[PDB]
Amino acid sequence: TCFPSFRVVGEKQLPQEIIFLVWSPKRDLIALANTAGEVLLHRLASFHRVWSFPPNENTGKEVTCLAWRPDGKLLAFALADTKKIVLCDVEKPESLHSFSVEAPVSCMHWMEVTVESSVLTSFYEDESNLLLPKLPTLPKNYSNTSKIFSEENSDEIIKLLGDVRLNILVLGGSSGFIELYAYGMFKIARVTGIAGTCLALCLSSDLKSLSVVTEVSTNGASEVSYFQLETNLLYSFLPEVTRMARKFTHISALLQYINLSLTCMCEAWEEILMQMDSRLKNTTTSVQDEQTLLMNQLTVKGLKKLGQSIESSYSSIQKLVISHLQSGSESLLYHLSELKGMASWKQKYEPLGLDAAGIEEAITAVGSFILKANELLQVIDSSMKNFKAFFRWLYVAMLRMTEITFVAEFLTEHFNERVGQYLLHFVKRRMENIIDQCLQKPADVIGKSMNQAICIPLYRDTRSEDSTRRLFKFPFLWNNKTSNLHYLLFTILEDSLYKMCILRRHTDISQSVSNGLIAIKFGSFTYATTEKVRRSIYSCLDAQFYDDETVTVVLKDTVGREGRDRLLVQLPLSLVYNSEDSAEYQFTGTYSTRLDEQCSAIPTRTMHFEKHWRLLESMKAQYVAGNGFRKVSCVLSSNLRHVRVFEMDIDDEWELDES
C-alpha cells in the first residue's frame, strides 16, 4: 500500500492573482503580494490569512518585490508607482519604517553577516553603539511615513531595527544601478553600469562577492546573463563600515528629528495664532488701545483664561526648542566628533569616503544651528514680555472698567506676524546640506569599489516575450553559507523543452570550484511500494533552493495534458555532485561565449527518482515556494490565484490511484 510523498496542510483559491510570493525564513508564515497591490501574510495551517496590508497614501498601489529580513522579524516591500519602499513589522500590517528610492525596484535581497563577525573591538559608552536616537517624543502623531519618534516611548521599534548585527538590504531594477542599504535603513553603496533589468540578486555571507542575473533585450528576444561582482572593501574593512553605518544612520535619523521638531513648533504656533486672530464693530482702527461688548462674552475671567492658553502655547515652544531641537543638535555633535576621531586614523577609515574636512565643516554648521536656535529662544522672551505686558495692564483696564514703554509694546503688538518670520532663517537647509554630502560620499566611493566583474552569459530567446506576469522567481540565486558558494538555477530550451541547469561559483572571485556547470534530465519516477515506474519526457517549469543540500523542482510531463500532467520533485545535491562519477560530468565548452549556444558541451546527469516527489492532483501547478527550516512548502498555479501548501517532511495520509 502506497502513499505519495508529501502531505497537504492547506489549499485555497485566492480572490486576486498572486504577483509575488516568499516564505518566512524562520516561521510557518508566508508573504504574498497580489495585483491589487496589497501584501498578504498567511499561516501554513489551512493557508489561513494572518493579515492584509492594503495600499494607501504612504504605500503605493503597485508593489513589485518582497524581502524578509534573515530574522523573519521584518518584512520589506517595494512600491514601483510611488517609487518608495516599506519596512513592515511582522506582527502587524503597518509601516514600521519607509523611504523613497530613485527609480522602481524589480529585485531585493536582504542579507546578514556571520555571527563570528558581529564581535566588537570596543572603541566606544551606551549611546555610541546604538543605531537610532531616542529623545523626547514628538507631540505630532503625524510621523509622516516612519513612526519612530512619534510613537510614544517604545524602545522596541528601535531595538528591533538596530540591536542586531550588520545586515544589508540590496536593491535592484531596470533603472541602471544597484543599491545597498545597511540595517534596511541607510545607503552604503550604489553600483552602476548595471545593464537591463535585475532578475536576481545575491550578496555573500562573507561579503566577498555579489551575484546578479540580468535581462537585456534585442527587441525580438531577450538575453539573460550572470555577473559576479567583487566587493572587497566590504570584506577587508567590515568593522569600520559597520561602525560608520551605525553612526550614519543615527545621524540621518537626527536630521529627520530636528526637521520634525522644527515643523512641530511651526504648526502649533500657526494654529494658535489663527484661532486667536480671526476670532475677532464698525469703527476702523486696529488700535483701540491707549467695543465694550468686548466684556459681555470675554470677561475679566475670559482674559485670564485666554492668558494661560497663550503662555502655555509659548511654553510648548521653548520646551520644544531646548529639549527637542537643541539636544538633537547636541547628539549630532557627539557623533560628529566621534566620526572625526574615526577619520583621524587616515589609513583605516578613508578608502571609505570620510573627509576629515567635510566632517569638520558639518560640525561648524551644527554649532551655528544650535546658536541660531539659542538666538531664537529670546525672540521668544521679548515677544512674551510684550504680550504679557499687554495682558496685565489690560486686566487692570478691564476692572478699572468696572469701578508703559511696553504700553508702546502694546501698541506694537496690536500693529502686529512678528513671530511668523523669525522662524535669512533656514540654516537648517544648509546644515543638512553639508551633512548630506558627507553621508552620500561613502556610498559612491564603495559602489565605485565594486567595479570588477565576472560575466557568464546564459541564454537568449523569446520565452519572456509572451507576456503574463513573470514573478521574477526564476532564474534563482542561492548563497551557501556553510560551503561558501553561489548557486544559480536556470533553464535553457533545447528541443523546445526547458532543460534545468545548476551553475555554481566560489564566493571568493579568484578561486574556482568543482562542477561549475551541470544539467539535469529526469529519468524515472517511482515509489518503493508501487513498481509502476513513470518514465516520460519532462520539461522544467520551476525550481527553488529548499536547503543547502536540496532543490525543489516543478516539472511538466509533456504528454499528460489534463490535470494529470505536472510533478513536484525534491532534488538532492548529494547525488548531483555525487562523489563517484562526478568526474565524468564536466563542461566541454567555454564560459567565454554563451552557455545556451553550446548544448552538447554541457554535462547532463540522468537521475532516477524513487523517493520524495509527487504527482500533483488536477493541480495546474506552475511555481514553487520552498521553506527548508520550518520544513513546509507551497505551490502556486498557472492562474496565480490557486495555492496548495504541503508539509514536506511527511507522507500523505491519502493512498494513491494509477491506471
Author numbering: 6 to 129, 132 to 287, 294 to 303, 318 to 430, 445 to 457, 473 to 479, 522 to 757
Show the paper's wording.
The anaphase-promoting complex/cyclosome (APC/C) is a large multimeric cullin-RING E3 ubiquitin ligase that functions to regulate cell cycle transitions by ubiquitinating specific cell cycle regulatory proteins and targeting them for proteolysis by the ubiquitin-proteasome system. Only four subunits are directly involved in catalyzing protein ubiquitination (the cullin subunit Apc2 and the RING subunit Apc11) and degron recognition [coactivator subunits (either Cdc20 or Cdh1) and Apc10]. The remaining 85% of the APC/C mass corresponds to scaffolding subunits, of which seven are large multiple repeat motif proteins (Apc1 and Apc3–Apc8). Seeking to obtain insights into these structures at atomic resolution and to assist in the interpretation of cryo-EM reconstructions of the APC/C complex, we determined the crystal structures of full-length Apc4 and the N-terminal domain of Apc5 (Apc5N).
We used the Xenopus Apc4 coordinates to determine the full-length human Apc4 structure to a similar resolution by molecular replacement. Apc4 adopts a bi-domain architecture, dominated by a 360-residue seven-bladed WD40 β-propeller domain (Apc4WD40) split by the HBD (Apc4HBD) predominantly composed of four long α-helices. Human and X. laevis Apc4 are also very similar, differing only for residues 120–130 (X. laevis Apc4 numbering) within the shorter WD40 insert that is an α-helix in the X. laevis Apc4 structure in contrast to a predominantly disordered loop structure in human Apc4. In the context of the APC/C, due to interactions with Apc5, regions of Apc4 that are disordered in the crystal structures adopt ordered α-helical conformations (α4, α9 and α10). In the EM density map, secondary structural features are well defined, whereas secondary structural elements at the tip and periphery of Apc4HBD that are resolved in the EM density map are disordered in the X-ray structure (α4, α9 and α10). In contrast, whereas the X-ray map shows well-resolved side-chain densities for residues of Apc4WD40, in the EM map, these side chains are poorly defined, particularly for residues of Apc4WD40 at the periphery of the APC/C, for example, blades 5 and 6. In the human Apc4 crystal, Apc4WD40 is secured through lattice contacts with two neighboring molecules (data not shown).
